[PDB]
Every structure is written in structure tokens, then in C-alpha cells.
Amino acid sequence: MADCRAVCSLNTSDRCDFVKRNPDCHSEGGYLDYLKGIFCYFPPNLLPLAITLYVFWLLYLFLILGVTAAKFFCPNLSAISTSLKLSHNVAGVTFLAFGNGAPDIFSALVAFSDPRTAGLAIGALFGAGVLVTTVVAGGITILRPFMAASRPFLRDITFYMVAVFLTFTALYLGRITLVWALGYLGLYVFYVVTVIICTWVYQRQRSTTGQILLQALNPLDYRKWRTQSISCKLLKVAKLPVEFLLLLTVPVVDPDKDDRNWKRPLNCLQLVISPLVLVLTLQSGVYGIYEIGGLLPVWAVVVIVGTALASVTFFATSNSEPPRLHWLFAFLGFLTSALWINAAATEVVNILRSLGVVFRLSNTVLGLTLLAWGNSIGDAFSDFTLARQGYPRMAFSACFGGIIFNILVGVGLGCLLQIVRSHASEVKLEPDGLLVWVLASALGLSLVFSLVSVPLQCFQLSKAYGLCLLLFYICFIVVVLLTEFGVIHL
Amino acid sequence: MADCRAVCSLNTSDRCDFVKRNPDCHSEGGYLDYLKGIFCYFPPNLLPLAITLYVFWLLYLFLILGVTAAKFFCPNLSAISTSLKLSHNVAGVTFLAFGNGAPDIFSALVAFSDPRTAGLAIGALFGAGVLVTTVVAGGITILRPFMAASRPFLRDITFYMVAVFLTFTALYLGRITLVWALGYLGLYVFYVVTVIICTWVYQRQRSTTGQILLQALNPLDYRKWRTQSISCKLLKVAKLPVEFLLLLTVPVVDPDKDDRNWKRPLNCLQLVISPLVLVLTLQSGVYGIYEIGGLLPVWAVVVIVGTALASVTFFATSNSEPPRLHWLFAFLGFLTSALWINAAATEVVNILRSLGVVFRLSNTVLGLTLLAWGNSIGDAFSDFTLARQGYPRMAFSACFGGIIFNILVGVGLGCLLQIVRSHASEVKLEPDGLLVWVLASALGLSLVFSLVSVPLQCFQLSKAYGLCLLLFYICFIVVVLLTEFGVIHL
Amino acid sequence: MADCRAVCSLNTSDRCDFVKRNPDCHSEGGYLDYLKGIFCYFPPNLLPLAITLYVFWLLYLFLILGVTAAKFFCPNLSAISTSLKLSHNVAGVTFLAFGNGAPDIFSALVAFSDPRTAGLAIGALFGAGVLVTTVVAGGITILRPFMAASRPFLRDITFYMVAVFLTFTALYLGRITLVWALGYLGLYVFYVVTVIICTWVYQRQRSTTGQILLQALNPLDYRKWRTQSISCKLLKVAKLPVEFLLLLTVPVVDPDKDDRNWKRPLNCLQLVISPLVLVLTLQSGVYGIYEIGGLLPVWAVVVIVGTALASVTFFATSNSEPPRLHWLFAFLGFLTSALWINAAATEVVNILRSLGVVFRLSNTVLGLTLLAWGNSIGDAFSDFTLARQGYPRMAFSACFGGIIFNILVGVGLGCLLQIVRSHASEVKLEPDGLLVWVLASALGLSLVFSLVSVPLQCFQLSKAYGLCLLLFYICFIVVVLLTEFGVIHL
């Protein structure tokens, strides 16, 4: 079984056949085989043509994540937070945490499925934790200075430190048993229960149709369209199709407007469209193709129920006033929106992974540097967007809550599933070199620096904190890159 | 002669006898031993519980240093500074320097008594210097931004750099003679004389009884007691006994009040209590028990003289007006207060040292770290408290004056005493590894960074300076810890 | 051929003869042989007194660069910028860039003349780039906070990154051909053309005699002279001769005054003095003595033409009103002033080089530490002075424009001249150790940190950016020094 990279040294005539019968280059989770397109479709003598196009494609992806987070994800999450009268810390700890941590948990599971890649998975988790706790927090503090909550910050950082030290001990022992995974799950459940109980205790003390449908689906404001410059007009033309598709798919609820963005026919159609998208997209449509008893597919029952509910709500409410349950739509407008993030992020990885092969690079770098960046690009986008809109407290609290979520839930679930499926009494962790311990030391240093600096700063997070964190991360990345290339021997 | 740690692998029945028979399991400073209590006094099984108790004890110690510095040390020192019309720089250079540097000098002497531990002593001095010049200054600048005096800062940093480079040369030569120690003493005397002369030259240019006694000893304000929360009430109850004892022992003079905290009967009793405490505590009752000619003990003459003076001042002054020499009491209220710091700090070390055995570590690096932290914990407390109260200039100047004091006086006195006692022509310094030179390079880097940054900042010390110093110290500590564990081979 | 340093171990009687017949450790550029003066002139038994004198001399040099930049260079450059209505970015990109980069280009040429020193030359270029991009920018931001232009900053940093990566690739290949040098020259020409075109496009969118001569040459204001303190008076007395000489030599044009500093007789004499100085200075007289086919010397024609022009302008204008071409004088008042910088900087190097020969100074590294500092001392002085006067944008833009200038033009011209003179098809670059790659990684890290930080800061360059850069540079210098002395083995 020759390596996949050997297709580069193999004759151009047989490269496509080698790919068709070569494994170790068929990552999934995406939708398009990029290596296949490079090596079989586009003219063999235009290698670069596909390349530059892909680069452009990559840039287009960074536009999509720029829009979905700016217009639909953050406003829906803010409406959810306002409707339930939740504090910023609680919302950041639970909702943004789940939305930013689901892909990381899925990647951790798919990596823990193979005992060989357990070290790669734990290293990727540590790298993502380092990146989020340093660079995301730094940008959050720099973009919008603010004052953080003292008690929730101390509580969250203490819980995160406990979780990190438990993971450190588990890695040092080189093995994880059933008891460890059960303890991780119990610790996360206890953290959530403590959040809810403390928040509750603190809360007690203070005491025609068609034209409106076409207009709602029009993303172009002609009055605004007329006054833009040439570059702005071109950017708007580029953004138009994806914006129209997202408007068609993702509902939005904004409490800042008197009408609360109520578009009765559009919302009724979305009540059918969004669940269908969810079932047809989750797990790449495995549940969509699933048949209930071999007679009725899941998607058919889904569309039937959606159409029934849409007809009921169409005949139940009027155009003038939005129903009292309108905020529930925001929940849907959240969930689907989060999905529109995740898939996009996956595609970004499918870019970085592939082009990489063109220039064979070390996994001691591909799996630890680029994989964590691809996993946390959605978190970075969402946190920066929320910081710009005017909610720094929530994003800053999520910056630790989400990472606690990934570490605890991902490690525990992966270990439990590996134990149950393989019927093994333990899962063995193989430490691949000293780079894992370097990552661990960097994470510990970042956590200690934050815990020492923020209370000493009287909880007024200025820009110097973020700038110093940025310097630290850049220096750490440079040190790691120098170590991998053999310049520094440890 | 087996190592003391071997008591851990030895049978539980003979552990107490093993501790008793070996004098090396003994530490001089503490009023109370700890390893003996862990082994013999406690039930062998309840080993964790006792440990937790000690942890609690440690926390209680951090409370004591929190009170003595906040209520008695800093106000007395401020009254002393105001009475003599001294500038902030002068007071920080002399008085706070002596008060924060006496334990470091004592430790340096007790370490230089043994030629083997000379390298450990010089490394501890360098580590304490690094910690004070970086972390203490960083916290001082972060807690309260201010504008520092340019000329005294430049003078102090130049003198400190000269002293550090002289120590560097002495260490490189690997030997210290009588001439070197005499030069160190002469340099410190010249520094003090220059301070006095320059300060003098500048200003010339600019041109019933019982009820009051019981009330003075009551630390509880009932009106204030009623309005505190449950946690605050519990904290006050915990602080009450030590506060009462300190009020009984340490006089305080506050010029901010009209009466200047004049409690005539309490002060008269303190005039006898404080000297008795000084003689009975200094050198662990060493001078404490000595007898004058074998007939009259020192403490008896002390109490006789104190009672005579107390009777004289009782019959000499009235309750209405405080005597013109009242500020002299502040001097006493300073000295005893400083002692109340030092002993406490020692106890903290007796915690860190001990528990260490149970989970021993690398004394080579640890001696350098935990020992310096224990020595400088009092300096850190005093400087942070003074910065909070509103005197950043004085603490910032002390941050260099005190370290000049420790380096010069400790090294010179240790070398002189070792030469005189052992009748040797020189004292040999053995460089233990490259970690000493790493410490030296870190100290030099910190000094160069300060000397380049502060003048370039127009002497307006902001928070970024301290935050950057904190990052530097954390990174340096992480690098040292990684080097000691064999991850990085030099 | 024994090394020059061997003169130190050789007998004092033959040291001067050895120097007279010693070809190594020598260099030409200044107007003095410092080693000859140390080892032959001053009494052989007074090694130190003379050394101290040189130290004083060095300090005097730092005074000269302090005056010429403060009084004549920056005001003339500001007048040039104001007269042509140039933006700050354009002026910093072209004029200050040439003035600060001419000596670096000359040193790069004189180093590329020898194929052995190509690695030393490229390392010196990288070190100067690192120092300017970090420390100079840090001081510029700290001394005067400001808001930078976004688009020119992004453009300049992108061009600099492209140039640095091209140099990285050329060094990795270990060879430079004619095509590479021609591409470097074409890239610099394209950069200049893009600057001019973009700048042009933007603005289109917005749409008796004797007494006055003696008074002009008097640098002492008696009214101001009377009120200074003793130290200030001594400093003024020390500065008087060089100030008088510079007033005699360098014309100055200040648009802030109504008369625009018009001194008709002094300017007429300067019209002859300045060109004569230029011809009989640059190239240390190299073109200085060449003859016109023996028909006449160049200096004679120069003084004849200067006297003719001076007579014409003397008979052409009056004392009351300055001519419309007066701003052209500023151009001259710029160029000669820049020369008064360059020579001084060279002398500084002739200090550092020499005293160093006395010591066992290194070169592998030192040739890159002290040489870059000596080359960029003029740039640092000019940028700090311009930042103090109130033009931070121009100096900050020059901080990248000038370095682009040195890298591109110096490398291209050196390679082209070496190829043409030696008739070789390529120039071979020998990488001397890993320190060159360490320098490259440091430069890349600094550039990445700037490109990530400045846009994230909303282009409001505060003091924390500069302070963090200063910390980074100090740490990097300490790491390099530790690596060279064998403490850290790579």
C-alpha cells in the first residue's frame, strides 16, 4: 500500500486511476473530492488553474462565514438571550458554546474512533484550546474594551483549570478507563447544574401577501444600491446569491424593530424548509435516506408534518401582529444558522488539507496547526462578530465555556464510545513526541497568565492584555515551527 | 547517613523515631515544626486531613500578612515619612528597604555560613531580585498608574546595574576576597551618603481611662458589624483574634485624625509590651535567655525600664492633648510591626518546605524558586498595600532600593563573616550548572528592558509596562521549569 | 599572515610597526586611524586615559547627530514636503527613505564586493531590517500616539513581505543570477511607479547686509543665554562650535516664519560652500581630486560656477522679499544635511569596531549586532526627532519604505555589480550557520505580528504596541547572545 503522495511522482496518465483506487486521501465530511478534481477533471496541464480558482473559492468561503455570522447567527442568538432574560455569561456558557463546539466534538469522536489517532486528537484539542483562549480573547479585548464579571470569570477559569489538569494526569498515566469518562461526564453535568443554580439564586436576590413575500426575499435596497461605490457595488453583487439563499433558508427574529421582522408567508414556508434542510443535511443525509420500516422515508414524514404545521400557523395568525410564540422561531433561526456555519468550516478544511498534499507537509503540523485553525475558524468569526455588535461579556465568557465544553464532553464521549464499541477495558493514549507536552505547557502558561492578570487588572480588560496574548501566540507558533524543522533539538 | 526522604519508604512504626534521631530533618526558623507533627503527632491514617488543615493554616497566614500590612505597617510608615518631611523616594530607599530586606539578609547569612550553599544563596538572591524587579513593579504600575521621578529613578537603576555587574564579575572569577566585601560595604555606604546629600541639596533649592482603654482594644464596630453580609461577618469573626492581638501589641499613629490615634493608657502599656516582645522574639530568644553576669536576666531589666518609662509618661501627659514626641511612637509602631511580618513569612516557608517532602521535587530549581517567593512575599504584600493606599512613588522606588540593599549588604556581610570566622583568605563560589547564568541573564534582561522603556515612556508608568513584565516573568518561569525536567537540554 | 589581534600579544615596541605593516583589522571610510592612534601616538603606558577620551568622543558624536537632525534635517524635509503638497506617506516613502538608506546601500555594496562576505552582508541587512521594524517603530508609537493610514500601510507591508520572501527563496537556493537582480530592480521601480500613480489618483478624487550676516551666524541668543542654568549653559557652550559650523554650511528653510529664514548674503555664500563640500566630501575625496584631462580640477570648475551663480542671485534679489524659488534651497539644505548625518554615523562605527579589537569581540554575530546598530543609528535619530516634532505618520511610513529601499536596491545593485565586474554567471550565497535563519525567522515573526496587530487595532497605534515590540527585541537579542556563547546548542 503506497502512500497517496506517491501519485505526485507517478505518471500523469495513471494519476486519476491511482486516486480512484487509492485510499488515504478520501476524507469525508465534505461534499466534493478536491484531489479528484485537481488530478482528473481540470486539464492535466493546467495544475495552477485549479489552484488559483481554489484559492478564490477559499476566499469566497471566508465571505460566507462573514455574512452568516453577521446577519443571522448573532441577531438570532441575541434575540434568544433577550427573550429568556438570560445574563450574558449564561448565554455564552451554554448556547454559543454548543454552537461553536459541535464540530470540535464531532472531529474528536471521528479521531478517537481509531486508537492510533488518539494522540493527534488530544493534541488538536489542546491546540484549539490554546488558540481560542489566546487569540480570540485578545481580539475580543482589543476590538471592544469592557468590564468583565468577576465571580463568573473566576468560576469558569477555575473549572477550566481543573479540567485541564485532569486531562494532564490522564495523559501522564497513558490510559483512560470507564471511570475517567464517567467522571468527565459527571463533572460537565455538575458544571451546568452549578451554572443554573447560581444564576437562579442571583436572580432571586435583586428582587397583499405576495408583494410582501417578494419584498422580504429581496436583499437589494435600490436606494442604498444607487449610492455605493464601484468596489462596494461589486462586493454586493458577489454577496447577493448566498444572501438570498440564506434569507430563504434561515429565519431571523430581531426585537429592535417594531414588527420584529415578522414575514408571515416567508416564515410559514421556512417552517417547512428548515426542518427538511436539517434532516437532509445531518450526517450527510444518512437519516434522510433512512426508511421507516422500508415503506415511508423520513423526509416524506418531515415535509408532511411541516406542511401541516405551516397551514395551521398560516390560518392561525394575521399579518398585522406577530404571535406570542414568535421568539420560538428564533430558536430555529439559531439552529439552522449554526449548521450553515459548520458545513462552511468543513469545506475550508477540505481546502487546506488538499492543496497541502501538493506540497507534502508534516502532520506533526497538519494535524496540530491547520486542523485546530479550521475547527476554530467558526468560533473566531462568531466571537469577533459578537464583540463588534456590542456584546463583549457574552463572547468573553463563551471563550472559556465553549472550551470547557469541548474538552470535557469530547474526551468523555470518545472514550466511552471507544470502550463500548471495542469491548476494551481501557483506551491507551500514545504520547507522540515532546510536542504534546509543549502544547500542554503553553496552555498552562496561558491559563496562569490570564488568572494572574485579569484579577490584578480590576476586571477592566484593556487592549494591552489582548496584544500581549497575540505576541505570546505568535512567538509560540514560531518556536513550534522552528522545532519541527530540526533547527531546535529538544 | 540516609536521606530524610527515606522516612517515606520506611515503615510507619519507626518513622517518628527516624525523625527524632536524625537532626537533619530539622529547620531552625519556625516557632513550630511540621514534619514531626505530620509523622508523630497525627494519626498515621488521617494523613490527608492534617495536610488539608495545613493548607488552611497557610491560607490563614496569607490573611495575617494581609492585615498587618494594611492597618499597622503602612500607616505607621506613612506617618514616619510625613513627620520628617521626607520625599517618597527617600523613604522607599531607606525604611521600606530595611523592613523588606532584613529576612533576605538573614537568609543570605545563614546560607553563606556553609561554603557548599554559597551558589544556592547567590541564586536565591538573583531570583528574589528578578521577582521583585518584575512582578512587584508590574503590579505596582497596574494597580495605580502614576508618574515617577526621573533623576532618582535613573540614579537607582544605574547603581543597581553597577552592583549586579560587580556580582556578575565576582561570580565569573569564582572567588570573593576581603577586598571585594569591603568594596561592597563601601559602595552601599557611598550610596546612602549620596542619597542623603542629594536630598538635602534639592529642597534647599526649592526654597474615664478604663472605658477608653476597653474601647481602644475593641476591634468590632457594632454599627458596622450589623450591616455586613454573612460572608463578611464570618471573615470579620475570623480576623477578630489576630486583630485584637496586633492592636494590643503594635502601636499605630495616624496624622489624618485630629487626635492622632492617641490612646494614653494603651500607649503606656504598649511602651512596656513592645520592647519585651522584641527581646523575647529576636533570634528566637537567643538574646532572649542570656543573663547579665548570671544574676539578672535581660528581660527583667527590660520590663523594669519599660515600667519606669510607662509610669513617667503616664504621670507626664494628659488624655486631652498628644505630646510633641508622639511621632516617635510611630517609629516603635513601625519596628515591631515589621517583625510581625517577618515571623509570619518564615512560617509560610515552613509550610512550603515541608509539604514538599511528601511530594519531593527538584531542589536545584525549587530552592531557587519557592525560597525566593517565601522571602519576597512580605515585600510583595507591603508594596501592593502601599500602592493601593495611594503612595505608588515610594513603593516603586523601594522596588529598587531594597534590592540594592539585599545584594550589597547581604553579599558583603556574608563574605566578611565567612572570612573572619573560618580564617580563610577567600570564599569560593561554585557555579551549580547553567541555571545560575540563566538567572543572571534574566535579571540583566529585565534591568535593560526597564532602563530602555521607562525613559522612553516620559516617566508615565502605565499598565502595559507591568502587564508585559508579568508576561515575561511567566514565560521565564515556564522555560526554567521545562529546562529542569529534562525537556530542554542546554 | 598573522591576525591583527596578535598585535595585542606582541611586544609594545613593535606594535606600531606591526600596525604599519598590518593589512588586516583595517578599514577606510572615516578620516582617522583609531587603532594607529591608540597603539602608536598616545603614550603606550596610558592605554586607558585615551580610551576614556574616545568614549567621550563617542558621546560627542551622539550630540552631533542630536543637533543636525533636530534643527536642520527635519525642518528642511518638512519644508520640502509642504512645498510640493506631498502627503506624509509619500515623503516618508521616498525622501526620508533615501536619506536614511544611502549608507546601508553603500555598506551592502562594499560587502558584496567580496564573495566571502555575502552572508555577512545579507545578515546585516536582515538585522537592520529587524531593528528598524521593531525598535524604531516602537519608539515612534510610544513617543507620540497617532492614527495611521490604512491603505498605504497595508500596501507597504505587503510589498515588504513579498520582498522578504523573495530574499528568503534566493537565500534558500544559495545563488543569485542576473535575472534575480533585474527582477529586484524592476520590482522597486514598479513600487515607486505605483506609489506615484496611486497618490496622483487619490487627490484628483478630493476635487545693512554685514550686520544681518553676522547676526545670522550667531548661534547664541544673549537674552536666552542669560536665563539658563549652569548645566544648560555648559551644554550650550559645548554645542556652540558644531552649531556654528552647521549654520555656516547647511542652509535651512522654515515656512513657519514670515521671512522664511531668508538670509540673502548667508544663502549666497552657502550657494558656493555647499556644492564645494559635496564634491570634496562624498567618496572621501574619491571624485574629489580627479582632474579634467589635466586641463583643470573638478573643484575649480565647481567653485567658479558657484561664485557665478552666487553673484547672479546676489544682484538678482533683494533683502526684503524671498524669491519664488526659495523652496529649492531647501532641497540643497536637505541633501548636504543628510551628508552631515552619514559621515557622523560612520565615525561612530569606527569607534565601536576599534575599541572592540582591543577586546576579544566576536564577528559571526557581533558583525551583525553592532554593524546594524551603527548603520541604523541615523535612521533611529531622524525618526525619533520627526516623531517628537509632530509628524508621526511620515516617520512610521518611512519605517517600512526605507527598509524596502535598502533590501531591494542594495541586493539588486550588489548582485548586478558583482556579476558585471567578475564576469560570473551567478553569485553564490554561503549560509554561515543557523544564526542567519534565526534572523530570518525573527524578521518574519515581527512582520506577521505587525500585520496581524495593526488592522485589528483599528489603525490607532497606541503605546502598548511599541512596548511589546521593545520586549520582543530585547528577548531576541538576549537569546542570540546566549546562543553565540555556547549556552544554547541548536
Author numbering:
A (entry chain B), B (entry chain A), C (entry chain C): 50 to 256, 300 to 582
Passage from the reporting paper:
Here we report the cryogenic electron microscopy (cryo-EM) structures of rat NCLX in cytosol-facing (intermembrane space) and matrix-facing conformations, with and without Ca2+. Each NCLX protomer contains twelve transmembrane helices and two sets of helical hairpins/bundles roughly parallel to the membrane.
Under Ca2+-free conditions, we also observed distinct assemblies, including all three protomers in matrix-facing; one or two in cytosol-facing; or all three in cytosol-facing conformation. NCLX exhibits similar overall structures with and without Ca2+ (both at pH 7.4). In the matrix-facing conformation, the Ca2+-bound and -free structures superimpose well. In the matrix-facing conformation, a cavity opens to the matrix and extends to near the membrane centre. This cavity is mainly lined by TM2, TM8, TM9, part of TM3, and the loop between α2 and α3. The highly tilted TM1 and TM8 (within the gate domain) interact with TM2 and TM9 (within the transport domain), respectively, blocking cytosolic access to the substrate translocation pathway mainly by the interacting F122TM1–L145TM2 residue pair, as well as the side chains of I433TM8 and N434TM8.
